[PDB]
Design a protein around this ligand. Structure first.
Ligand SMILES: *c1cc(NCCO)c([N+](=O)[O-])c2nonc12
Lengths: 254, 17
């Protein structure tokens, strides 16, 4: 990871434990850390403390391999960006004054998605070109440019909760027929091609949330958080409530 | 008949000026 070497990079930690580290580190103005963005690919999040309050600024990776906060200047890397903002707040509540370094012995938190992608890539090369051992590991180095991006976008397509060709009625039928537990959900595509539907049960009723993607390629529910992939979308709404009546929990059969 | 999101419980991120 371009940020692994940075001592204030915490990897894929949630906002909650991110704020716990900033709290343990003194909550001084300009106290900051870096963590992986769970909504975008190759993106980061700048967690910042000002006036004893937490400020979280998404850093999304541009098409040309640079990094930028929305409506802010671009930088060649996380190292550069933090170096820049250390001397010019240029939008932030204040400059980055003191890095919230990882405790001794603690390394960046490995991400769920990145490990899933790693296994899917290795699985693709395995069944396609019939390779094993180091001969497979070497093939993954060269055969991970486009497919790495393709497997990420299509990760949901291989997931249990994803249903290939179900209408609203077909979904509601077996949804009830089961444990009827809260949070039991599923995902499915729709007629408008670039849209999907998130169906789940909560207490009494089957709810349905319209998912649409705006070009730039980012999926979202109207007036909701935007994701780069449907997999990240579903995984985000498992822990964070984020608008839903009830966060996702369990899945339906394949 | 799609359900509107609760605009009051969306997770909010900060932005520049
Ligand atoms: C800084 C970094 C990049 N690309 C990422 C490779 O490190 C670009 N670029 O457009 O290729 C750039 N342009 O101006 N500064 C940078």
């Amino acid at each position: 990871d371009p940020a692994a070497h940075l001592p204030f990079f915490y990897g894929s930690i949630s906002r909650a434990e991110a704020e716990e580290h900033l709290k343990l580190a003194g909550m001084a103005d300009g106290l900051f850390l870096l963590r992986q963005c769970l909504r975008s690919l190759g993106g980061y999040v700048l967690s910042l403390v000002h006036d004893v309050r937490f400020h979280h600024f998404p850093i999304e990776r541009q098409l040309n391999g640079t990094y930028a906060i929305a409506g802010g200047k671009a930088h060649c890397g996380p190292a550069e960006l933090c170096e820049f903002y250390s001397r010019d707040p240029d939008g932030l509540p204040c400059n980055l004054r003191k890095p919230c370094n990882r405790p001794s012995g603690l390394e960046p938190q490995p991400g769920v998605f990145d490990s899933l992608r790693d296994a899917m890539v290795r699985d693709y090369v395995r069944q396609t070109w019939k390779l094993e051992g180091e001969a497979l590991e070497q093939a993954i180095i060269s055969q991970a440019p486009q497919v790495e991006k393709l497997i990420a976008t299509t990760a949901h397509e291989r997931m249990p909760w994803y249903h290939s060709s179900l209408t609203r009625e077909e979904a509601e039928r077996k949804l009830y027929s089961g444990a009827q537990t809260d949070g039991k959900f599923l995902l499915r595509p729709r007629k408008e091609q670039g849209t999907y539907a998130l169906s789940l049960i909560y207490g009494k009723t089957v709810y349905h949330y319209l998912i649409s993607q705006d070009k730039a390629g980012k999926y979202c529910i109207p007036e909701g958080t935007k994701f780069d992939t449907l997999w990240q979308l579903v995984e985000y709404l498992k822990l964070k409530a984020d608008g839903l009546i009830y966060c996702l929990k369990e899945a339906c059969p394949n | 008949l799609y359900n509107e999101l609760n605009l009051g419980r969306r997770e909010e991120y900060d932005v520049l000026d």
